């Protein structure tokens, strides 16, 4: 059985970073070679394991998380980083065994007038815990206080990205997939060829 590499990486639509989707992979033979003649990865970095050793390892459980981020913020998807995305949207633990893949997708996620279909959170009361998701729509009083209208110092937490075709390489969309696998005393699920 082939892997669903053509179903996760060839999807029609990707979710926003604040509402990222996680998928579980069943029994599979990891044949990455069917992905080489179609796309090239601008960022491919693995922590805890060498990328060339995936052919001789079998994982207890595998998860794939998908989202889309700006170009300059791709560096924030790492164990010990700090910043807006790392604190308020997606946080990764320090003891992380997995891989991160990121590729440029300007040709279809950008436009001449601008795409505004991707949102992210810019203010939150406290920093996030690893592997957590928040879907609130409150009004962010900076100092704790109560307000029921969007006016002075009461800001909605979500703001949209700005994607233009003629923008520079730091402001171009990038699609990011995080593959996280565990090694426990359980029967193996995904194995190499």
């Amino acid at each position: 059985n082939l892997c669903p590499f053509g179903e996760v990486f060839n999807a029609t639509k990707f979710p926003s970073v604040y509402a990222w989707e996680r998928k579980r992979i069943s029994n599979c033979v990891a044949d990455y070679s069917v992905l080489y003649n179609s796309t090239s990865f601008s960022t491919f970095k693995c922590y805890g394991v060498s990328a060339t050793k995936l052919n001789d390892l079998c994982f207890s459980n595998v998860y794939a998380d998908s989202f889309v981020v700006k170009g300059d913020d791709v560096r924030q998807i790492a164990p010990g980083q700090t910043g807006v995305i790392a604190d308020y949207n997606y946080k990764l633990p320090d003891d992380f065994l997995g891989c991160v893949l990121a590729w440029n997708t300007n040709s279809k996620d950008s436009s001449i007038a601008g795409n505004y279909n991707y949102l992210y959170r810019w203010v939150r009361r406290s920093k996030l815990n690893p592997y957590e998701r928040d879907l609130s729509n409150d009004i962010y009083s900076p100092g704790g206080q109560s307000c029921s209208a969007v006016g002075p110092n009461c800001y909605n937490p979500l703001r949209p990205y700005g994607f233009f075709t003629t923008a520079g390489v730091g402001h171009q969309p990038y699609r990011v997939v995080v593959l996280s696998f565990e090694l426990l005393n359980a029967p193996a699920t995904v194995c190499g060829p």
Partner: protein
């Protein structure tokens, strides 16, 4: 819930929104300037209107934040830049009156025309009719007619309006906690709150005067030299003792002395340096010119250009049906978009202008990491200075030979250097007194020292004392001569051109000192010197986030503007002029007038 913490989030919001709308406005403006249609004009006007409205509403909510409870200086700088009240403090009627006055003055300046008697049909505008005769003609009477006709059919209609203008502006200044409008203009150079790097608004005046006191000797000699040559051109019109008539100084107002070069060449048998023919021979295009400029900038350590610059810039005239403006400009649209717009042609002048514009782009590229409000130069003179030092470096014979554009057999003789130095002097040195006198007159009329009835009487007194230029026809009080220039009649400050000139020569000598140059400073090149590039980048990266005194010290090692490098640059011409002026008299007397 400190006010400081509440203001940080507000600034974050403001930056994020300002990026997007500024980008939209810039894109619309580019679409206009590349391609002229009515629809493009409408789109530009819409975008501009939205950006002005957004800025005004943002300023109106910013005043909630008191400035005296903030300790971070970046935050105070941003808030102070955003909290300026503008002209909105005046009542609605007065604001409407002021806008009407400004629009009327701009229109009348831009549409005025004159024509000589007995020819009611053929009337010439300022451009390109009056400029051609002013810059090319050799007849006394035609030049006098043009000068007086332009200053008697356009100035008179400006004298009453300008009057009201002054009063209105003064009131606005006094509602902004300023002494007068001159203080408002001078406030750009003010820095306070940092220990050891402070600058008062009224200090600048003093320094300017001090600097001018050291330029008076050299200029004086140059003045004498020019007079002698002019005595040959107009045998019975110039006194050997007095000043120079105003209608014989190249341009209309006497701002530059460039056009006199043909009449004042030291050695006319030696042709100037010109490389256009070699450019045409080797089949050079615009793309080659810009590639050469990019290589020159790379050689000193600074980065390359991104793919957007090559893909989106318009380096050639579109021609055919399309019409576009051909004034060379460098655009920073934001969000990592940099462009250059110029109608390139194969000539040496375009070769130098490409370097100028690319220096602009490099400076704009250096400080892209600063917040939105701090994405500008330290003051209004750094931007252009950076532009001009590169053009100065790129025109040397060494650099021309290095890129395979001049014959290796070419050997320089001191006559050619003297000619080049005189040509540069007639454009650089001859404009400083004019600028200083104009700004001093404007400052003193705003301050209230000169009463209204004594305006013109002062204007031609200073001209005979500082610049040494006399009037050919007596002028009554009804005239408004200073309003005849573009900058005065369109509300633009005029001191940037002096600090700009001193700063560029301060930078050049400091950069050449780190490249281990040996010899005169007028033959320096900075190619293959990474130390000079690092020293320049240290200043370029800062932006407006620091006081300009620190920015200057990071390059030259001094905290204030200085004039010694200019004299060091022009020393050989100084000694040559001193040698040849042994028979003429140096200086002028005010009492002589052409009609006396």
């Amino acid at each position: 819930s400190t006010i400081e913490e509440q203001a940080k989030t507000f600034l974050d919001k403001f930056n994020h929104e300002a990026e997007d709308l500024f980008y939209q406005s810039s894109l619309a403006s580019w679409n206009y300037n590349t391609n002229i249609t009515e629809e493009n004009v409408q789109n530009m006007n819409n975008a501009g209107d939205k950006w002005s409205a957004f800025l005004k509403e943002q300023s109106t909510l910013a005043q909630m934040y008191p400035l005296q409870e903030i300790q971070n200086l970046t935050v105070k700088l941003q808030l102070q830049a955003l909290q300026q009240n503008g002209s909105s403090v005046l009542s609605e009627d007065k604001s409407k009156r002021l806008n009407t006055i400004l629009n009327t003055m701009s229109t009348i300046y831009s549409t005025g025309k004159v024509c000589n008697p007995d020819n009611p049909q053929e009337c010439l505008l300022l451009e390109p009719g009056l400029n051609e005769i002013m810059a090319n003609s050799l007849d006394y009477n035609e030049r006098l007619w043009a000068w007086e006709s332009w200053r008697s059919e356009v100035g008179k209609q400006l004298r009453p309006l300008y009057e009201e203008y002054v009063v209105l502006k003064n009131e606005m200044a006094r509602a902004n906690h300023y002494e007068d409008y001159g203080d408002y203009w001078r406030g750009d150079y003010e820095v306070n709150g940092v220990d050891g790097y402070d600058y008062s608004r009224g200090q600048l005046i003093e320094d300017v005067e001090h600097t001018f006191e050291e330029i008076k000797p050299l200029y004086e000699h140059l003045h004498a030299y020019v007079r002698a040559k002019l005595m040959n051109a107009y045998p019975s019109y110039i006194s050997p003792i007095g000043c120079l008539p105003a209608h014989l100084l190249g341009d209309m107002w006497g701002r530059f002395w460039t056009n006199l070069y043909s009449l004042t060449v030291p050695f006319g048998q030696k042709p100037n340096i010109d490389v256009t023919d070699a450019m045409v021979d080797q089949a050079w295009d615009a793309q080659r010119i810009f590639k050469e400029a990019e290589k020159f900038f790379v050689s000193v350590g600074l980065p390359n250009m991104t793919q957007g610059f090559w893909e989106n810039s318009m380096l050639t005239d579109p021609g055919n049906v399309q019409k576009a403006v051909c004034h060379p400009t460098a655009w920073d649209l934001g969000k990592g978009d940099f462009r250059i717009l110029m109608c390139t042609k194969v000539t040496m002048d375009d070769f130098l202008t490409a370097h100028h514009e690319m220096g602009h782009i490099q400076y704009d590229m250096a400080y892209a990491a600063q917040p939105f409000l701090l994405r500008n130069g330290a003051n209004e003179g750094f931007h252009e200075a950076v532009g001009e030092i590169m053009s100065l470096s790129a025109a040397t014979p060494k650099h021309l030979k290095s890129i395979g554009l001049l014959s290796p057999d070419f050997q320089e003789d001191n006559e050619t250097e003297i000619n080049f130095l005189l040509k540069q002097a007639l454009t650089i040195v001859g404009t400083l007194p004019f600028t200083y006198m104009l700004e001093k007159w404007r400052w003193m009329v705003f301050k209230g020292e000169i009463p209204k009835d004594q305006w013109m009487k002062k204007w031609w007194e200073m001209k005979r004392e500082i610049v040494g230029v006399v009037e050919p026809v007596p002028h009554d009080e009804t005239y408004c001569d200073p309003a005849s220039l573009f900058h005065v009649s369109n509300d633009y400050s005029f001191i940037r051109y002096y600090t700009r000139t001193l700063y560029q020569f301060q930078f050049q000598e400091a950069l050449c000192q780190a490249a281990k140059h040996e010899g005169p400073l007028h033959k320096c090149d900075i190619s293959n010197s990474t130390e000079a590039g690092q020293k320049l980048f240290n200043m370029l990266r800062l932006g407006k986030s620091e006081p300009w005194t620190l920015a200057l010290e990071n390059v030259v090692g001094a905290k204030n503007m200085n004039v010694r490098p200019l004299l060091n640059y022009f020393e050989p011409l100084f000694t040559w002029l001193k040698d040849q002026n042994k028979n003429s008299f140096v200086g002028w007397s005010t009492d002589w007038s052409p009609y006396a």
